[PDB]
């Protein structure tokens, strides 16, 4: 009763053997999983980096594409400017800004850069001061339809009435072209 | 005998201690791998989101670039159109769409928007039925599209509306709702 | 001579505990295997999407490049166009001549617009041929020469006008790269 049964210990040895095999398989599978995991990590880093690069490039391109959607300027510090939507090219020269009942009035000359006339252009305009959300809420906007005839190479007089802002506060202007009713001839 | 041998039991105990070591190692490794897997899953969710956004932006930007490559229109719902590739600017006005044997003929005027004459322009043209509104219908539609290159020795003087005829076989006027037209610049001459 | 009973009892207990631990570890191994499979598949998909995206972005970049400036090999080019989205110019190279410590490009420029433009400035970079290999680029760039040509040239609409570009540091036969762009600061429209 001080000592152990031989057969019981034999069974123990067999069990220890089976455990040995199991432990082996576990170690092996563990190495496999380690490899796969490392591979996954590195691939992920690569993806994140490449994505980073792509977003930067695409941001630059978007930024440059903005130039065809509209023209932004400070009418207090600009004489000549250009409006180009990829179809119609116009040049503008600001003659003067004058106060009129509640707001400002921009007198300017517009000129059709093309070889054929363009008529009945409409202008999308937003204006204000030189911030992000309220400065955007403090911007007024409108679409000016026109019957203006722009003959090729001819500086033509145009008046932009902008209510709500005095001349000395008028330091922001975003202007774009609406081509809904455009006719490529004399009106 | 009837009892277990001492030495054999010592051997077994030693192998058991060894097994204890290996087991402890396996547990530790299992835990760290668990942690790594967690991280990988979270990071993957983020990656899926971010990639979705990126694809979204790239799509728009690339679409915007297509406006200079060629001009797309429904000739049945269009009078004026513009072709501009960054070098040559042309305007066009559709006078009429006429039926021929198994096709349509478009009579139009083209005009050079620039200040110097351009000559020997070639036109890449693709035409057919209306552009399908669903993405799954795209490949079949593309396979059904008709294409050709119109070589013209037409000289376009600055500002002068000039008569041009596009013969498009394969599609009747009432089915002709897609026209894609671009400029080939290989043999273009400025003067 | 004989093994101790107590020691053996202890050994059986510990062996049983080992058995439980091993079972748990096998279970966890299965779970981890499944999760790893998921991760691998999703990541293959992602890698594909990313590959396509980079592919597209490349062509986009190399296209906005054409609005940014005009790149050419003046030894292989007669006619060319410069267009920054506002001003359109057409150029024809008449000759390239060697001068003191460089080359001179005689060319005709013509304003593609309907109004005259004046006081154009030109940003110019020039040098030896742009190499095909992409690894050679960062070194080839270092060796490029640059300058800004300020002008009082009046470009009337549709009128081919003589312009001379003096480019020091490179002989005519070695002048195979010219990058030219428009500076718009002092542009006057008369």
Author numbering:
A (entry chain C): 23 to 152, 159 to 215
B (entry chain A): 23 to 213
C (entry chain B): 24 to 213
Q: Which sentences did the original study use to describe this structure?
A:
SadB is a trimeric lipoprotein located in the inner membrane of Salmonella spp., with homologs in other enterobacteria, including pathogenic E. coli species. The sadB gene is located in an operon with sadA; orthologous operons are only found in enterobacteria, whereas other TAAs are not typically associated with lipoproteins. In this study, we determined the three-dimensional structure of SadB using x-ray crystallography and show that SadB enhances the surface display of SadA, suggesting a direct involvement of SadB in the autotransport mechanism of the trimeric autotransporter adhesin SadA. The reduced amount and increased stickiness of surface-localized SadA in the absence of SadB and the decreased resistance of SadA to proteinase K in the absence of SadB all suggest a direct influence of SadB on SadA export and folding.
